[PDB]
Amino acid sequence: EVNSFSGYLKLTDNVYIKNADIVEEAKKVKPTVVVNAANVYLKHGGGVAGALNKATNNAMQVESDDYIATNGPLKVGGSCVLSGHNLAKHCLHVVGPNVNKGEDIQLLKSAYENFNQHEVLLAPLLSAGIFGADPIHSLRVCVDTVRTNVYLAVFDKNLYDKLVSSFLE
Numbered sequence: 001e002v003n004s005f006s007g008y009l010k011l012t013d014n015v016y017i018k019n020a021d022i023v024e025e026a027k028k029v030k031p032t033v034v035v036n037a038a039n040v041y042l043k044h045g046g047g048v049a050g051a052l053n054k055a056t057n058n059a060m061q062v063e064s065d066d067y068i069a070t071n072g073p074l075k076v077g078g079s080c081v082l083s084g085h086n087l088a089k090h091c092l093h094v095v096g097p098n099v100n101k102g103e104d105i106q107l108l109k110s111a112y113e114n115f116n117q118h119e120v121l122l123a124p125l126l127s128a129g130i131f132g133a134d135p136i137h138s139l140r141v142c143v144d145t146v147r148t149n150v151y152l153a154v155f156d157k158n159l160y161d162k163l164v165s166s167f168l169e
């Protein structure tokens with residue numbers, strides 16, 4: 001079965017959300033596209049990006065270093081398409097702003113705009129966690145910006161509940 005997402009809550013006609021680890025979702029679903037919460041040099045050192053790279057047994061990092069050698073770094077708000085390895089057909093590496101490191105929150109709209117080049121995606125909540133954006137704001141930007149079908153995996157039941165309550169106000 002293709003893109004067999006289960007147990008998601010439909011928020012809008014094109015945005016779905018689940019309390020789940022994106023790595024476990026990718027292994028089960030093998031979506032056409034999994035989004036990585038990347039940085040501009042594609043160094044997958046921790047958090048979501050480190051977890052996805054480890055699930056590929058470091059194949060993602062070697063491919064990412066060869067992409068950077070030939071093409072140079074991404075811009076904040078930008079993206080590139082590389083292999084999905086064992087997790088998906090493709091990985092869309094998207095750079096959201098890191099507000100904790102002084103980057104502009106307005107670039108979160110540009111970051112989500114990359115999703116619109118793909119019909120269906122499994123994705124994390126961009127710029128949340130240690131990137132420092134307000135996660136309720138990130139969900140609002142996602143809902144207002146993405147027009148293709150996005151399945152958001154948020155690996156924290158406390159945050160999941162706060163996000164759904166906020167959306168349903």
Ligand SMILES: CC(C)[C@H](Nc1ncnc2[nH]c(-c3ccc(=O)n(C)c3)cc12)c1ccc2c(c1)S(=O)(=O)CCC2
Nearest residue numbers: 021022037047048051125127128129130131153155156
């Ligand atoms: C808000 C968080 C609950 C959310 N975390 C996550 N959301 C979805 N799937 C996840 N898997 C793991 C994980 C982490 C270690 C690990 O060994 N495994 C297996 C799995 C984390 C995780 C999240 C959303 C976006 C971003 C971050 C964190 S960050 O990595 O702090 C900075 C980049 C932006």
